Design a protein around this ligand. Structure first.
Ligand code: C8E
Ligand code: C8E
Ligand code: C8E
Ligand code: C8E
Ligand code: C8E
Ligand code: C8E
Ligand code: C8E
Ligand code: MG
Length: 549
């Protein structure tokens, strides 16, 4: 789709966002037959996801060679709570059934959102406008089972309700049960309100029990020139392993405005966050109270063939104090349908609980800091939409353990040089969506490649319909990756060879109300790991259906 909200919080055409952007819709997710968020993200440019096995197991997201803690994940605009204790986003627990849209914008965005937005930003949206009720379910390899009931209806004029329940289970397993309710209200044709509440109960296998609930409420104004939003959020998670218990409550309040001025816009906002942990959470002795407040400004202008886009933010954190970030981009459409874009931006990552207050803690840590430069050419040629970008990311003040003193300090440096190339085009009835990433991510002090990241990836999606059958084939090449073997000491660095992977999916409208679908994932039964030592699934079959009325 064309409109995004994730670049500056407010709706704008993608063509006007100078950073590389990707949008995934629910229609996309339904066709691909993804059974996890990771399976969605894995398909997209610059994404390198590793996982300790199959569904539900611990996983890491490396966007454009950056550390796992250097991606900002938002759910409906607000920092994912599950990232809260460890200070690093893991989506393996977040229910796929709740995903209605993903908006993913690469490059820095601390200047809008604050901490973590270094490699990029991933915004998982849970809202839909899609009247009706749906029942669906599926069955697959490894005793995979799913069923789900969902309904959105009008409760008179101005108010609409959404209700969802979902059960997902797999064995070696992982069991996830989810409930979601939302109420939306139009006071007028410009003033809106919403209240949202959801929660899930996950069990994974040593056993993990994870409870998470989130409540959001807000008010929005959508006028001809002026747009505003006041947004409230509360998330509570309890993560049991066995025993340890990690428990965090996260409080968010944000107020943002934006106005259309000429061929462009200007915006500002204030963003407050409180996180509270329980004693013994995150292997820290005491319970902690962390607070952050940020203020920022955005801008977009089009003059002639040129486009200018920018943001700047000041954050005040209860532990490290004040840190400012900014970014600026310019695009030149030098000939119709072609653009050169140049970008610069700074971003940062806040120290986490363990690093500050754990056994090896240092309460005076400063943030990790990033500087990025990016240049791109984008075009439309002979029916092909394409883009190629080169970026450099210098990361400094990395928080590292010193074995000399058994404490964490700011000191490491990394340098990432990367290339992203993308294209989409049709050939008769066939649709092609392709990307290539080169990622040269290095310790800038030793000049050694960083571990766990593939230097090269190729991803290819091929879609077409013939009789009434909707077919999709997905191809991925995962390049070579260096990792450590933790089965025994000492921990040896190993070299995992590149692998090719293929998936095949089909759908068919049995009626206008009933759609049946099947999928064979890892069609050639390739044996491979994304984390050394941890076996992935192998060839799996899934058969599913959805009935709408
Ligand atoms: C009235 C200010 C609104 C935009 C401020 C955020 C921009 C932060 O850096 C921009 C300054 O750096 C050079 C700006 O050059 C072009 C300005 O960007 C145009 C935004 O409308
Ligand atoms: C590297 C030095 C830092 C320079 C800071 C520059 C501050 C930005 O000032 C330029 C602002 O220009 C336009 C501001 O935003 C206007 C948005 O819409 C304007 C309508 O035409
Ligand atoms: C609203 C747009 C904001 C753009 C401003 C970004 C410009 C960055 O300013 C320069 C960076 O900060 C200067 C650091 O000062 C050097 C430290 O030396 C002090 C020694 O005590
Ligand atoms: C509407 C508020 C807009 C705030 C944007 C400024 C915050 C981002 O600033 C950029 C940070 O880069 C330099 C600022 O940090 C240096 C602090 O210097 C203060 C004393 O000289
Ligand atoms: C790195 C970006 C490269 C930009 C290359 C574009 C330079 C010229 O592009 C094509 C200009 O128009 C030519 C299109 O082909 C002829 C179509 O003529 C119109 C049909 O009557
Ligand atoms: C504007 C797109 C960048 C072009 C992609 C590959 C073209 C290579 O030109 C020379 C190769 O550059 C050597 C290093 O390439 C990786 C660096 O990426 C840019 C980071 O500085
Ligand atoms: C891509 C280099 C020449 C100009 C780009 C044309 C359109 C690019 O779409 C390519 C999508 O397919 C992947 C291309 O992979 C080769 C580019 O890799 C650059 C090597 O550093
Ligand atoms: Mg020494």
């Amino acid at each position: 789709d064309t409109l995004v909200v994730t670049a500056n919080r407010f709706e704008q055409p993608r063509s006007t966002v100078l950073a590389p952007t990707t949008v995934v819709t629910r229609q996309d997710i339904d066709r691909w037959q993804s059974t996890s968020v990771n399976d969605v993200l894995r398909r997209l440019p610059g994404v390198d996801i590793t996982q300790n096995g199959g569904s539900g197991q611990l996983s890491s997201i490396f966007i454009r060679g950056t550390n796992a803690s250097h991606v900002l994940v938002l759910i409906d605009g607000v920092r994912l709570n599950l990232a809260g204790v460890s200070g690093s986003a893991d989506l393996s627990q977040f229910p796929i059934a709740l995903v209605q849209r993903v908006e993913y914008i690469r490059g820095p965005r601390s200047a809008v959102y604050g901490s973590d937005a270094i490699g990029g930003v991933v915004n998982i949206i849970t809202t839909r406008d899609e009247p009706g009720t749906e029942i669906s379910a599926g069955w697959g390899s490894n005793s995979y089972q799913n069923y789900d009931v969902s309904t959105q209806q009008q409760l008179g004029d101005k108010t609409r309700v959404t209700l969802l329940g979902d059960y997902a289970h797999t064995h070696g397993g992982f069991l996830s049960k989810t409930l979601y309710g939302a109420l939306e209200h139009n006071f007028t044709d410009a003033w809106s309100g919403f209240v949202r509440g959801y929660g899930y109960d996950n069990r994974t296998n040593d056993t993990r029990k994870l409870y998470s609930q989130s409540w959001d409420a807000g008010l929005r104004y959508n006028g001809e020139l002026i747009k505003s939003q006041l947004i409230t959020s509360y998330s509570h998670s309890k993560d049991y392993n066995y025993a340890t218990l990690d428990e965090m409550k996260q409080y968010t309040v944000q107020w943002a405005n934006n106005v259309i001025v000429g061929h462009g816009s200007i915006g500002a906002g204030v963003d407050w966050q409180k996180q509270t942990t329980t004693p013994g959470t995150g292997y820290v002795e005491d319970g902690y109270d962390q607070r952050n407040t940020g203020i920022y400004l955005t801008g977009l202008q089009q003059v002639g063939d040129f486009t200018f886009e920018g943001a700047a933010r000041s954050d005040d954190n209860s532990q490290f104090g004040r840190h400012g970030t900014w970014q600026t981009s310019a695009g030149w459409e030098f000939i119709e349908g072609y653009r050169f874009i140049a970008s610069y931006g700074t971003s940062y990552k806040a120290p986490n609980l363990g690093q500050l207050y754990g056994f090896y803690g240092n309460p005076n840590l400063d943030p990790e800091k990033s500087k990025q430069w990016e240049g791109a050419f984008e075009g439309l040629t002979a029916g092909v939409n394409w883009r190629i970008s080169g970026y450099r990311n210098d990361v400094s003040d990395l928080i590292d353990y010193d074995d000399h003193t058994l404490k964490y300090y700011n000191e490491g440096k990394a340098r990432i040089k990367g290339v992203e190339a993308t294209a989409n085009f049709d050939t008769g009835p066939l649709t092609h969506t392709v990307s290539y990433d080169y990622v040269d991510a290095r310790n800038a002090i030793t000049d050694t490649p960083l571990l766990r990241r593939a230097k090269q990836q190729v991803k290819y999606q091929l879609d077409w319909q013939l009789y009434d059958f909707d077919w999709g084939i997905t191809y991925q090449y995962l390049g070579t990756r260096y990792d450590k073997d933790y089965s025994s000491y000492p921990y040896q660095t190993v070299k995992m060879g590149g692998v090719s992977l293929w998936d095949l999916a089909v759908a068919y409208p049995v009626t206008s109300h009933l759609t049946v679908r099947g999928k064979i994932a890892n069609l050639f039964d390739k044996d491979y790991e994304t984390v050394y030592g941890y076996q992935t699934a192998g060839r799996e079959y899934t058969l599913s259906g959805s009935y709408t009325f």
